Amino acid sequence: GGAREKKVQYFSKLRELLEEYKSIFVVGVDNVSSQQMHEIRKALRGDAVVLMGKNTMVRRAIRGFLSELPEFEKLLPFIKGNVGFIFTNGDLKSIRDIVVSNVVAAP
Amino acid sequence: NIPLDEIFEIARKMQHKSFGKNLASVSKEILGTAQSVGCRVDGKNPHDIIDAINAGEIDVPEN
Amino acid sequence: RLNEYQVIGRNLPTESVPEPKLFRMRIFAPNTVVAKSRYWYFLQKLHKVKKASGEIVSVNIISEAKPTKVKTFGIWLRYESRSGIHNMYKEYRDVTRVGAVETMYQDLAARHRARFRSIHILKVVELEKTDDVKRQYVKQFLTKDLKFPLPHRVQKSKKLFQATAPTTFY
Amino acid sequence: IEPSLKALASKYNCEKSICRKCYARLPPRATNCRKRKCGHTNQLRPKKKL
Amino acid sequence: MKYIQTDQILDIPEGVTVDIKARVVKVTGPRGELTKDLKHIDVTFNKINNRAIKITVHNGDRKHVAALRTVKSLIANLITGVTKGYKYKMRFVYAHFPINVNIIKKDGQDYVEIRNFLGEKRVREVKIHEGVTMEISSTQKDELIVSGNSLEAVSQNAADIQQICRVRNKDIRKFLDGIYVSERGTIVEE
RNA sequence: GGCCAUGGAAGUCGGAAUCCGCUAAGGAGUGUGUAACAACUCACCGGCCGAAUGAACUAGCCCUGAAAAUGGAUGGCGCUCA
Numbered sequence: 001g002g003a004r005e006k007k008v009q010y011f012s013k014l015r016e017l018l019e020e021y022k023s024i025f026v027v028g029v030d031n032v033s034s035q036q037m038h039e040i041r042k043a044l045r046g047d048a049v050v051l052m053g054k055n056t057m058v059r060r061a062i063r064g065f066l067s068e069l070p071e072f073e074k075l076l077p078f079i080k081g082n083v084g085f086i087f088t089n090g091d092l093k094s095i096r097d098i099v100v101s102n103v104v105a106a107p
Numbered sequence: 108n109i110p111l112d113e114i115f116e117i118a119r120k121m122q123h124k125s126f127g128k129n130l131a132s133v134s135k136e137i138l139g140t141a142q143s144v145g146c147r148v149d150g151k152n153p154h155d156i157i158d159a160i161n162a163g164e165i166d167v168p169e170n
Numbered sequence: 171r172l173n174e175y176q177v178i179g180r181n182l183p184t185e186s187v188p189e190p191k192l193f194r195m196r197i198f199a200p201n202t203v204v205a206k207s208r209y210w211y212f213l214q215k216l217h218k219v220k221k222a223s224g225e226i227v228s229v230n231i232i233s234e235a236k237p238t239k240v241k242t243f244g245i246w247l248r249y250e251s252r253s254g255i256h257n258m259y260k261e262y263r264d265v266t267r268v269g270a271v272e273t274m275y276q277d278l279a280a281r282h283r284a285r286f287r288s289i290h291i292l293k294v295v296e297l298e299k300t301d302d303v304k305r306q307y308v309k310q311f312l313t314k315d316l317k318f319p320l321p322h323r324v325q326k327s328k329k330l331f332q333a334t335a336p337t338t339f340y
Numbered sequence: 341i342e343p344s345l346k347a348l349a350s351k352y353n354c355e356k357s358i359c360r361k362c363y364a365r366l367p368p369r370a371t372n373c374r375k376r377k378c379g380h381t382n383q384l385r386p387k388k389k390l
Numbered sequence: 391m392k393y394i395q396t397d398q399i400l401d402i403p404e405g406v407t408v409d410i411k412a413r414v415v416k417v418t419g420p421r422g423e424l425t426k427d428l429k430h431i432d433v434t435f436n437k438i439n440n441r442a443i444k445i446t447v448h449n450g451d452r453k454h455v456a457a458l459r460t461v462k463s464l465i466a467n468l469i470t471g472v473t474k475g476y477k478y479k480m481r482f483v484y485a486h487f488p489i490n491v492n493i494i495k496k497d498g499q500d501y502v503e504i505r506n507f508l509g510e511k512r513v514r515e516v517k518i519h520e521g522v523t524m525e526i527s528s529t530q531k532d533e534l535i536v537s538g539n540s541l542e543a544v545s546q547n548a549a550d551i552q553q554i555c556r557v558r559n560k561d562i563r564k565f566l567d568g569i570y571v572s573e574r575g576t577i578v579e580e
Numbered sequence: 581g582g583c584c585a586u587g588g589a590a591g592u593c594g595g596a597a598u599c600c601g602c603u604a605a606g607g608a609g610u611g612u613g614u615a616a617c618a619a620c621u622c623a624c625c626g627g628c629c630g631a632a633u634g635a636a637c638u639a640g641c642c643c644u645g646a647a648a649a650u651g652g653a654u655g656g657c658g659c660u661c662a
């Protein structure tokens with residue numbers, strides 16, 4: 001098994017706080033350095049969460065979780081392509097304010 | 108040894124390193140290279156102080 | 171050209187044991203003289219019995235149940251090479267259990283130089299499910315609506331000379 | 341030679357593997373020698389550099 | 391293993407009309423026509439539609455199966471030769487002696503004339519293949535552009551030019567002089 | 581720009597080390613490049629296509645291993661789904 005441990009582990013914290021936090025939204029990124037991310041995290045120690053991982057697996061583990069929190073019932077056909085995960089519990093105005101920036105964009 | 112209480116200051120001193128979720132991870136990181144050469148690090152070599160601290164030895168919640 | 175035989179034998183009865191257990195083997199042999207010989211060859215590989223201390227009780231041909239139904243057979247083998255002794259498993263398409271075994275002997279003769287004397291047939295099984303087929307070279311003939319031509323036909327002539335140009339259409 | 345052109349030249353003259361038995365000049369990623377005289381050996385080693 | 395049947399699918403773009411009869415492929419496109427005889431291979435062709443062609447090998451062994459996708463790739467190269475063209479760019483590599491390259495015409499034939507290669511008094515001449523266009527790049531210093539519809543002729547002429555500029559009796563790791571293919575693309579950029 | 585060596589070595593000259601933290605991802609680093617950085621490339625994790633894939637081993641025919649002297653012998657011709 002080996003990886004399946006870390007596999008189901010990625011499916012552990014995958015939820016837990018899921019119900020705790022409020023309805024999140026899109027989190028798209030591309031060509032993002034590791035330092036970039038790392039710093040964004042600091043800006044969110046308790047402000048939010050910085051979850052990341054693959055695309056298909058992320059579905060599967062939760063794609064069937066339509067038994068514990070069915071709620072979604074369809075809140076899944078949205079992870080398309082390069083997709084991360086940033087949690088939160090506040091308001092929309094206090095969202096992009098505590099991310100964005102940290103830009104290295106260029107030609 | 109030289110763990111003392113003043114190494115927890117090097118944490119807040121170099122509190123610009125490992126963003127480690129909790130500040131104690133600064134110490135953890137600080138210690139993480141403390142074995143680089145290996146010295147009198149708590150009268151021993153790291154990976155036995157550090158690793159154990161993460162495993163849960165005493166307790167240093169440090170605010 | 172082979173047939174499948176059911177050979178049944180037993181140890182000779184003694185005053186201690188007057189009805190020894192009857193043992194049957196399925197033997198693929200060209201005739202009944204070799205069928206009873208192969209039986210004793212394999213019993214002495216397993217049991218404390220001899221032809222001198224034993225008795226052949228019955229020899230019967232086992233005919234194919236549906237000789238005009240196309241089947242796929244799996245054959246488990248144990249053969250001796252020039253260097254060692256090996257177990258193998260192979261698959262064949264044929265309509266009779268005997269005709270698959272005839273192909274097997276030709277097949278291990280051709281690809282491994284394994285003579286008849288070097289081969290033990292462990293088991294011949296007809297594969298009921300299409301998922302039971304493990305080998306590619308026979309699974310490719312289990313596809314739906316299988317069609318293929320036969321290009322480059324060579325015609326055998328009764329005469330030495332033909333006055334018209336040869337052709338290979340077909 | 342400018343470094344851009346020296347890498348282009350090195351792609352054809354230097355970035356190679358060598359057969360240990362017959363000295364054939366092989367692609368760096370080759371697993372066997374292409375020559376029949378050595379038996380398509382896997383005993384290769386990178387072409388040495390200055 | 392004698393695979394029962396193996397298939398490859400050619401794709402014909404909109405302006406291209408492939409035309410196959412007795413293993414002689416004639417591909418027609420906006421840029422022209424190219425033909426190739428494949429009588430040394432046993433393959434069969436089926437026209438799926440005006441934009442697709444099935445290429446089949448029946449009951450072929452491992453090597454004869456290996457010869458099928460190469461047919462696919464050659465015909466695809468023909469298609470892109472008559473719809474996009476081919477372009478190889480060569481850079482002139484020398485440490486000390488500049489290479490004097492001219493496009494000459496002798497005996498009614500076009501030639502590539504290499505002079506002063508590594509200081510040699512020898513004048514190297516490479517015949518320019520039919521259907522192959524040479525040009526001295528104006529936008530780049532020490533660049534040769536080899537272009538044409540046929541990939542085989544263009545790459546082989548380029549190889550002729552590269553091979554005639556080989557270094558003898560020296561350490562070629564140190565004496566890196568020569569003419570090398572630097573860019574392999576198409577006339578129509580994508 | 582880890583420690584020590586070092587004129588300099590900052591991962592990519594050389595020695596004790598092979599850790600920590602964020603991580604899903606990253607080695608105190610697999611290379612090209614520098615006096616040295618930088619720089620790019622990898623290790624691993626990502627997006628993408630979507631059905632198969634990798635490793636070790638066994639034995640058949642073929643190839644290499646396989647160099648001697650007049651020209652020359654599966655008996656000869658010749659033979660390649662033989």
Ligand SMILES: [Mg+2]
Nearest residue numbers: 054055056057
């Ligand atoms: Mg995933």
Ligand SMILES: [Mg+2]
Nearest residue numbers: 261262277307
């Ligand atoms: Mg067979």
Ligand SMILES: [Mg+2]
Nearest residue numbers: 333334335336
């Ligand atoms: Mg005629």
Ligand SMILES: [Mg+2]
Nearest residue numbers: 360384385386
């Ligand atoms: Mg070596």
Ligand SMILES: [Mg+2]
Nearest residue numbers: 558559560561
């Ligand atoms: Mg030499």
Ligand SMILES: [Mg+2]
Nearest residue numbers: 558559560561
């Ligand atoms: Mg010399």
Ligand SMILES: [Mg+2]
Nearest residue numbers: 251282639640
């Ligand atoms: Mg064998």
Ligand SMILES: [Mg+2]
Nearest residue numbers: 645646647648
């Ligand atoms: Mg000899």
Ligand SMILES: [Mg+2]
Nearest residue numbers: 648649650651
């Ligand atoms: Mg002689």
Ligand SMILES: [Mg+2]
Nearest residue numbers: 653654658659
């Ligand atoms: Mg002979």
Ligand SMILES: [Zn+2]
Nearest residue numbers: 359362373378
């Ligand atoms: Zn070799």
